[PDB]
Amino acid sequence: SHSVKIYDTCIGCTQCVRACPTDVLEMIPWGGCKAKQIASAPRTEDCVGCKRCESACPTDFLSVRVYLWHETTRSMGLAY
Amino acid sequence: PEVKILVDRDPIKTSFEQWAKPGHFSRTIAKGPDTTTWIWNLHADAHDFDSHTSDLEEISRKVFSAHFGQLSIIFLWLSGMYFHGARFSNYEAWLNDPTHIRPSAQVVWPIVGQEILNGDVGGGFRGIQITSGFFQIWRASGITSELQLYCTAIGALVFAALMLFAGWFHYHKAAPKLVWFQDVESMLNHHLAGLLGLGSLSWAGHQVHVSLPINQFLNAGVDPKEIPLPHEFILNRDLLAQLYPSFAEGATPFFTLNWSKYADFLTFRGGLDPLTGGLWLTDIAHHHLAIAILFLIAGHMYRTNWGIGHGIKDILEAHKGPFTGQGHKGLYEILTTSWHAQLSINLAMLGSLTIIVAHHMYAMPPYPYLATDYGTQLSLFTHHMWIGGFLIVGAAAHAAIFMVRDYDPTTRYNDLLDRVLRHRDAIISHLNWVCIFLGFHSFGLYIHNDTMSALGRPQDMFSDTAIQLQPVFAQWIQNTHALAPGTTAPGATTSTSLTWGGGDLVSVGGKVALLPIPLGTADFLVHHIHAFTIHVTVLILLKGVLFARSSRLIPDKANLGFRFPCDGPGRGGTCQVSAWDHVFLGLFWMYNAISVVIFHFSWKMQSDVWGSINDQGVVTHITGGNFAQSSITINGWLRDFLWAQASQVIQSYGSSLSAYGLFFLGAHFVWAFSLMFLFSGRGYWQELIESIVWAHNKLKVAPATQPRALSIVQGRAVGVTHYLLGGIATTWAFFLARIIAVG
Amino acid sequence: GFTPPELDPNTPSPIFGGSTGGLLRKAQVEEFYVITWESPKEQIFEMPTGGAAIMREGPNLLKLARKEQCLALGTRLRSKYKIKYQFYRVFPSGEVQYLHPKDGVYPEKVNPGRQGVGVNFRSIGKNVSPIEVKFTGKQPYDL
Amino acid sequence: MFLISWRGYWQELIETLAWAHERTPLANLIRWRDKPVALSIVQARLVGLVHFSVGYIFTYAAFLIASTSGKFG
Amino acid sequence: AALYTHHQYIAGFIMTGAFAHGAIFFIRDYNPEQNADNVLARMLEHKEAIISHLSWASLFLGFHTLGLYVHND
Amino acid sequence: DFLVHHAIALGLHTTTLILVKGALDARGSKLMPDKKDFGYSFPCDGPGRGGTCDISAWDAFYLAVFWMLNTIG
Amino acid sequence: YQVVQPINGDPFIGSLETPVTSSPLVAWYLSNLPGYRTAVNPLLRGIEVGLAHGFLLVGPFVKAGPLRNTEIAGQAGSLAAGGLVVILSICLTIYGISSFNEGDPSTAPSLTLTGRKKQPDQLQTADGWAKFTGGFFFGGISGVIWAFFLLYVLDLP
Amino acid sequence: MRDLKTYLSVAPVASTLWFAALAGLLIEINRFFPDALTFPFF
Numbered sequence A: 001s002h003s004v005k006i007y008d009t010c011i012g013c014t015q016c017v018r019a020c021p022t023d024v025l026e027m028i029p030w031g032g033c034k035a036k037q038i039a040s041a042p043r044t045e046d047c048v049g050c051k052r053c054e055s056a057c058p059t060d061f062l063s064v065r066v067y068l069w070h071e072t073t074r075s076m077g078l079a080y
Numbered sequence B: 001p002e003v004k005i006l007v008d009r010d011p012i013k014t015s016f017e018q019w020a021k022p023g024h025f026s027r028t029i030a031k032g033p034d035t036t037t038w039i040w041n042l043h044a045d046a047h048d049f050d051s052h053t054s055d056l057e058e059i060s061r062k063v064f065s066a067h068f069g070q071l072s073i074i075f076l077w078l079s080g081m082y083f084h085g086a087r088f089s090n091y092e093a094w095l096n097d098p099t100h101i102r103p104s105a106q107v108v109w110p111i112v113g114q115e116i117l118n119g120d121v122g123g124g125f126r127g128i129q130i131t132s133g134f135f136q137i138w139r140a141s142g143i144t145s146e147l148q149l150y151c152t153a154i155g156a157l158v159f160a161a162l163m164l165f166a167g168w169f170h171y172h173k174a175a176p177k178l179v180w181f182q183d184v185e186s187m188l189n190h191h192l193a194g195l196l197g198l199g200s201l202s203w204a205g206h207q208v209h210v211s212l213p214i215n216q217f218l219n220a221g222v223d224p225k226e227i228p229l230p231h232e233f234i235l236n237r238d239l240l241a242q243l244y245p246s247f248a249e250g251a252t253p254f255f256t257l258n259w260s261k262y263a264d265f266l267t268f269r270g271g272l273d274p275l276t277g278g279l280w281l282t283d284i285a286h287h288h289l290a291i292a293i294l295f296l297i298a299g300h301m302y303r304t305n306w307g308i309g310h311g312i313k314d315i316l317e318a319h320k321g322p323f324t325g326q327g328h329k330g331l332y333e334i335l336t337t338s339w340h341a342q343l344s345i346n347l348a349m350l351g352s353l354t355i356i357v358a359h360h361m362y363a364m365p366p367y368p369y370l371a372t373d374y375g376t377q378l379s380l381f382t383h384h385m386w387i388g389g390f391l392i393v394g395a396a397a398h399a400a401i402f403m404v405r406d407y408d409p410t411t412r413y414n415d416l417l418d419r420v421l422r423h424r425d426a427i428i429s430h431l432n433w434v435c436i437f438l439g440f441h442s443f444g445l446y447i448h449n450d451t452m453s454a455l456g457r458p459q460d461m462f463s464d465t466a467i468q469l470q471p472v473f474a475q476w477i478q479n480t481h482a483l484a485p486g487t488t489a490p491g492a493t494t495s496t497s498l499t500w501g502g503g504d505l506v507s508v509g510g511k512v513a514l515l516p517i518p519l520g521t522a523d524f525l526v527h528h529i530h531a532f533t534i535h536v537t538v539l540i541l542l543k544g545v546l547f548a549r550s551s552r553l554i555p556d557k558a559n560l561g562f563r564f565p566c567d568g569p570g571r572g573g574t575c576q577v578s579a580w581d582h583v584f585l586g587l588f589w590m591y592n593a594i595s596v597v598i599f600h601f602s603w604k605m606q607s608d609v610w611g612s613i614n615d616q617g618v619v620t621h622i623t624g625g626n627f628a629q630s631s632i633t634i635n636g637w638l639r640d641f642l643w644a645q646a647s648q649v650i651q652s653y654g655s656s657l658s659a660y661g662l663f664f665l666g667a668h669f670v671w672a673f674s675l676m677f678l679f680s681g682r683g684y685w686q687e688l689i690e691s692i693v694w695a696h697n698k699l700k701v702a703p704a705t706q707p708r709a710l711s712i713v714q715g716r717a718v719g720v721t722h723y724l725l726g727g728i729a730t731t732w733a734f735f736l737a738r739i740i741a742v743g
Numbered sequence C: 001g002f003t004p005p006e007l008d009p010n011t012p013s014p015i016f017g018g019s020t021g022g023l024l025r026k027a028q029v030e031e032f033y034v035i036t037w038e039s040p041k042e043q044i045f046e047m048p049t050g051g052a053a054i055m056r057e058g059p060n061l062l063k064l065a066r067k068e069q070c071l072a073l074g075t076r077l078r079s080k081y082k083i084k085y086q087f088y089r090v091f092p093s094g095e096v097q098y099l100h101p102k103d104g105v106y107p108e109k110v111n112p113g114r115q116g117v118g119v120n121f122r123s124i125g126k127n128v129s130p131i132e133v134k135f136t137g138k139q140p141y142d143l
Numbered sequence D: 001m002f003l004i005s006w007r008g009y010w011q012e013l014i015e016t017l018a019w020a021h022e023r024t025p026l027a028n029l030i031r032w033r034d035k036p037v038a039l040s041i042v043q044a045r046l047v048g049l050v051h052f053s054v055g056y057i058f059t060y061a062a063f064l065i066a067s068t069s070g071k072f073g
Numbered sequence E: 001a002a003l004y005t006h007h008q009y010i011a012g013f014i015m016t017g018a019f020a021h022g023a024i025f026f027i028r029d030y031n032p033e034q035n036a037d038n039v040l041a042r043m044l045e046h047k048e049a050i051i052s053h054l055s056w057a058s059l060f061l062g063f064h065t066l067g068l069y070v071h072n073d
Numbered sequence F: 001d002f003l004v005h006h007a008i009a010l011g012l013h014t015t016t017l018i019l020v021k022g023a024l025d026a027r028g029s030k031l032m033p034d035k036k037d038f039g040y041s042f043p044c045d046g047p048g049r050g051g052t053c054d055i056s057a058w059d060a061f062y063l064a065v066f067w068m069l070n071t072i073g
Numbered sequence G: 001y002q003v004v005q006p007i008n009g010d011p012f013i014g015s016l017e018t019p020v021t022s023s024p025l026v027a028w029y030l031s032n033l034p035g036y037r038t039a040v041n042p043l044l045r046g047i048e049v050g051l052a053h054g055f056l057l058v059g060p061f062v063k064a065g066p067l068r069n070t071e072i073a074g075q076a077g078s079l080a081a082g083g084l085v086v087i088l089s090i091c092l093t094i095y096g097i098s099s100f101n102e103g104d105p106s107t108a109p110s111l112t113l114t115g116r117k118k119q120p121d122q123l124q125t126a127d128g129w130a131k132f133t134g135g136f137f138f139g140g141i142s143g144v145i146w147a148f149f150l151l152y153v154l155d156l157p
Numbered sequence H: 001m002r003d004l005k006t007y008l009s010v011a012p013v014a015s016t017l018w019f020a021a022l023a024g025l026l027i028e029i030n031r032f033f034p035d036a037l038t039f040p041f042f
């Protein structure tokens, strides 16, 4: 299972959650930004590691990060 | 319903304002550059019409006028060829003695010592020997003075200006609408009966009145200046009736149906002309007559405006059975709404046609004095093989584009496409297997042979002396083609080609034009190598097409486009899943297959076909005939073909062939230069550009359009482009230097 | 707090002709997935494995082999059509698992009953150097 | 090969082959214990580079020894 | 000839490894705060000026060497 | 001897450039400022930010081996 | 009417039905082979296997090997086929060793083509696979012996 | 006409003209002073 971490520079634009192809991410309420929103990653046992979320984040530097880690059946994307 | 002209007036206005605003066609480019990447995108998307807009009418208008531009360019290139034949050539002297003067239609200025490239090509002339075979065409045409070449250069220039004007006109003043383009029945009726029928009829006419009599006079020995002008043959007809008595009755037979009385100049001989080493002109005229009749009839199949004819939709809907469901229902709607489907079918057919042209033109030489001009024959075969391969690969590219951007079962459903999509797994499995099996049983034999020859065990080889693998069917078929004239073709005298056999050999000027080509174990091995390479190329391209929309690995691939780098390093890594990357990979394998084809043909022709014959009649081939015994190992290809024939090009420094020696080395350089783009990635390059940019910033000399490294896809594309250029140019220099040097 | 629906078998399936892209041995021994939706009428749609199928008017129940397949099909169903879908994970035991949407709302909309998983309260430039975590099994981003 | 062709193409090919095998009679009585997958990205680079430099050393060694030993001078 | 080529090629591999373990050291075991403002951190502090001048030198040599060889050819 | 010695100098300078850049950028650069959190060797950082193929320091080593082989050649 | 149908009406299994995979002649044939005789002792099936394959593997090693023309050694090249039988039965043994354990049931399917339960095929055991191994090997070596026994001239020795 | 003056100053056309003129200049220099290996003046 890969690791996905959210950092407090997040502006809560939700662009990363819209992009995930396996539904790893989620929005949760917060108080540190104008959107009162922050991303979370509750379901990292399904993450294929495509970094489609990182291409979508606009902050500099990134607010979502994907660290590739130990591989499994779901992580490798095997249908057999 | 009915067919008519449909046009709009003044759709776009002629202006310069859009020239000064780069990237007007795409909204993203129009905005202007921030980084250098912009400049690349501007060129990559320049002719992607159906991506600049959504409207089919606009795409078709652009395509039509772009075609006019291409035709104008081709006419300008023809104009140049004829003008150079007329002005800077030795064509007249070659016309006087064709088997001693080697043709040349390009001279160079004496600027930095480069005038050494103006070599002694015979006839009181010094220049560059050409290999396009234009003198042979101009002789087969009847052209005998440079004034006719001037005239055709001027006519071609006029036609090029005309094409350019029509290209402007049909886009800016009178632009046809979609319903005009989407009428395929009338289009096919015109191209079948009007372009190909009337074309070959008119050409048969020219051969009957100009080429035939002027070539009769030339082969009789008459001085090329004392031959009458062609139009004389038309004004005075007794001139024609002296060479062909049948021209006295003059179209009375063609009506009295006694076509027999034309047997004078419309023959069915077969074989070559033993004076010039080409096909009988009386055969070619009759051929063109027959082809014109066939096409003129075939251009009356489809219904346009008078009931009679065939509806394409009806033909397609009628065909279906118990294995294919409803098949062919729904292909007329597809083949009339996507340009990419049409382009794929057309490219496939044109590439295959070019390869067939290569084979038929070596085996049954059409022009006079072409068969004994070895450099021209090699050049033509090789050129046309390369063109055919490239077009076939483009066919796959545009089938993939159709699958990603146009296929849509919600509004245009076809059954056969759906069923192939539903068993693509079995398809790709079986093709994969057959390529592995074919690769083991052809290259493996070579490896067995090399190892048995190095282990001092030649009786254990796969060869004509130890373990024979004779292609029985090929030998059987060419034996049937030998016995054909008189048994299954009573109307023919000689058989279609001299390669079939019968013991007939044709010579010209002490050179060998043609003779029977022998098939043996080596021919068997080479042909199975060829089957292997073609199967592999097919596997790569068809895998790219069939899985362009989705996979078990990436189930929504169509949403990422047709040309994307990857879908990230996850799932194990997904570099090069797009169909563009499959085209990119198939280009290398096409290069491999065509290269082996042209090596096989080049070595075989010198070894068993080309050479010199003696008055006593003993043929000495250019190479000694070593293809039967040295082609069966890899060491024989490295030693007896590459090392032994590169001598001509590595020894041209100081002669007039030194440009080939320079291009040999330049092409090696460009090939090795591409590996840098192919083996690396853009992260390294952007990080190096960072420090270089720092150095520029230190001196207030840094540019405002921020430099970036190339794209991932651009890296791949630059890599394959330089790889192909380097390799093909190396073989070009090798071939031309070698063949020009010996003869 | 949003009881999730149950899996109702005997729910019909779309009209398909069969294809070599469907389930394999992994669905026999490891796991597979099931998606269900509504389909106001019968309509054609592109299978996420092969060609085209016809979804029936009323509930629809498809069995696929990967979560990504279900989610790509659901994205297609939710935007191009206006359809609500749910999918589940079935084990070889005969055990179902409602999967998505987890708490009844789509994850791109913030719901007040969610906790934060994997959130660091600092910028990404404030991770320690690897030398700080050497010989102990944590990772610099673990904190 | 390993240096110009990259991973995705090969992984899709392997999925096709796995289907083919699992579907054929008398041969699906045999079951692998590791699911076959294409090589890794870094792994492919390493394997390509290894082939490249092995070929390098071997061809040059053969030529150098044969062209000095053949003349022995 | 054999000895010379063997020892030069082994020296080249050893050089590439000598430089690889420097990057491994910089990633794994380097501690910034414990090397504050000494020769090592100073090397890190003007990496642009080192890379830019190496780049200039190698551009210059490549341009003029290949140019003179092509002139002569 | 003059010309080939300048070719040798070009080779040494370019191999040094590759290896030194790989070493001095292994803790992070502008295109990836947190590279040290990823290890010595890793494939890429996906196709975002323009694309990051071959950005690890292992990859600089892998590129430099080609130039080493060319130089010793 | 159409000829191809989804496997047993289920259009979401990754396969199809054709005249190649589900046809009465093919079904009956493939059914009456050793590997598909579920209700039979593993060793008998293995015996059939080894017999047929030793006999088949005789020919090529004889008519193609290095001593094909030397016939003071041409015919006795059955040594090679015996060695090949030995090698791939060693491979059979290690495959069975790694794929199974005696204290575990046999992984074969328990359902049949119509939806009735079957007693799992015992060839997929550890025990029965070792039994089948012995059968195949016995048959292979003695089939090599048999097809070497028929050295009498026929049409092509 | 002004748009044409702008277009003629776009990068590819400007470089084309610049280098064609430079090429003519070097070509004519070498046609007048051929085979120079040194500065033979002072």
Ligand code: CLA
Pocket (backbone or CB within 6 Å): B669, B672, B673, B674, B675, B676, B677, B679, B680, B688, E055, E058, E059, E060, E061, E062, E063, E066, F010, F014, F017, F018, F063, F064, F066, F067
């Ligand atoms: C024959 C193949 C080849 C060539 C010519 C080069 C050349 C170069 N490499 Mg490279 N490399 C190669 C293969 C090659 N490489 C391979 C196979 C790999 C492994 C993937 C690498 C990996 C690599 C790396 C990692 C790096 C280089 C670098 C460099 C540059 C070094 C600086 C220099 O020498 O100044 C210039 C030398 C030249 C030979 C340039 C020649 C081209 C001239 C200018 C032609 C002039 C054009 C002329 C006007 C006509 C144009 C035609 C028109 C149609 C455009 C240089 C341009 C380094 C670099 O970027 O330095 C800063 C660098 O970091 N290379």
Ligand code: CLA
Pocket (backbone or CB within 6 Å): G065, G066, G067, G077, G079, G080, G082, G083, G084, G086, G087
């Ligand atoms: C590295 C060690 C090695 C050795 C010692 C041999 C030895 C031999 N090889 Mg071989 N080979 C090798 C590596 C080796 N090979 C590799 C790596 C390859 C792959 C490229 C090949 C590919 C190869 C081929 C394609 C062929 C040989 C053949 C032969 C035999 C030729 C001489 C002969 O006719 O004998 C006498 C003739 C005999 C039939 C002797 C048979 C040997 C006994 C009787 C077999 C008994 C086996 C035994 C039950 C158990 C098997 C091994 C066990 C100890 C584990 C010979 C015994 C040829 C051959 O004869 O085929 C058999 C031949 O066709 N080799």
Ligand code: CLA
Pocket (backbone or CB within 6 Å): B063, B064, B067, B068, B071, B180, B181, B183, B186, B187, B190, B191, B194, B195
């Ligand atoms: C006898 C009628 C006729 C003829 C001879 C042609 C001939 C041609 N068509 Mg065309 N076409 C026709 C009818 C005809 N068409 C009809 C009825 C339709 C649909 C209504 C189309 C729709 C069509 C399309 C969409 C396209 C063509 C294209 C082409 C060119 C194909 C490429 C080629 O082989 O170039 C061979 C080159 C030559 C033979 C050189 C000689 C060129 C001569 C002068 C052509 C003149 C024929 C033309 C019909 C004259 C009418 C113009 C007149 C009003 C002044 C070719 C010249 C392609 C094209 O336009 O390229 C620009 C293409 O895109 N045609």
Ligand code: CLA
Pocket (backbone or CB within 6 Å): B043, B044, B045, B046, B047, B048, B049, B390, B391, B392, B393, B394, B395, B397, B401, B562, B563, B580, B583, B721
């Ligand atoms: C009738 C032939 C034909 C036509 C009309 C098209 C048309 C089209 N193609 Mg296509 N294609 C063809 C044949 C054709 N192709 C063939 C034969 C191949 C196999 C190689 C391909 C493979 C192909 C691919 C892979 C792609 C297209 C794409 C496209 C679209 C955009 C092209 C573009 O503007 O890029 C811009 C054109 C350039 C940047 C010019 C490139 C210059 C080349 C690389 C240099 C060649 C060197 C030169 C020959 C000699 C060296 C000179 C130098 C030394 C000075 C366009 C609709 C693209 C697409 O996305 O489709 C939607 C796409 O990516 N084609």
Ligand code: CLA
Pocket (backbone or CB within 6 Å): D050, D054, E013, E014, E015, E016, E017, E018, E020, E024, F040, F041, F058, F061
């Ligand atoms: C005394 C010398 C020395 C020592 C002790 C080490 C020690 C170490 N190195 Mg290192 N290195 C060295 C020299 C040395 N290196 C040199 C000379 C180079 C330049 C080539 C490198 C470049 C290098 C890199 C790029 C990396 C290391 C890594 C490592 C660490 C783990 C290596 C490992 O086990 O991976 C496993 C060992 C292998 C995979 C070797 C098997 C594959 C080899 C290359 C194939 C051999 C070729 C073939 C079999 C022979 C020909 C075939 C036949 C036909 C003849 C380890 C602490 C790695 C690391 O983990 O980072 C810390 C790392 O990425 N080294």
Ligand SMILES: CC1=C(/C=C/C(C)=C/C=C/C(C)=C/C=C/C=C(C)/C=C/C=C(C)/C=C/C2=C(C)CCCC2(C)C)C(C)(C)CCC1
Pocket (backbone or CB within 6 Å): E018, E019, E021, E022, E023, E025, E026, F023
């Ligand atoms: C005696 C004599 C002389 C002198 C000499 C001299 C003066 C010397 C030298 C020399 C030198 C002076 C050399 C050198 C070299 C060097 C090198 C080759 C280097 C290196 C480095 C590296 C490889 C690095 C690594 C790293 C990194 C990257 C980072 C981290 C750390 C480390 C360190 C790990 C003469 C000749 C005059 C004369 C005779 C006598």
Ligand code: SF4
Pocket (backbone or CB within 6 Å): B565, B566, B567, B568, B569, B570, B573, B574, B575, B576, B681, B712, D041, F043, F044, F045, F046, F047, F051, F052, F053, F054
């Ligand atoms: S960025 Fe490059 S290396 Fe990384 S996955 Fe994409 S194509 Fe592969």
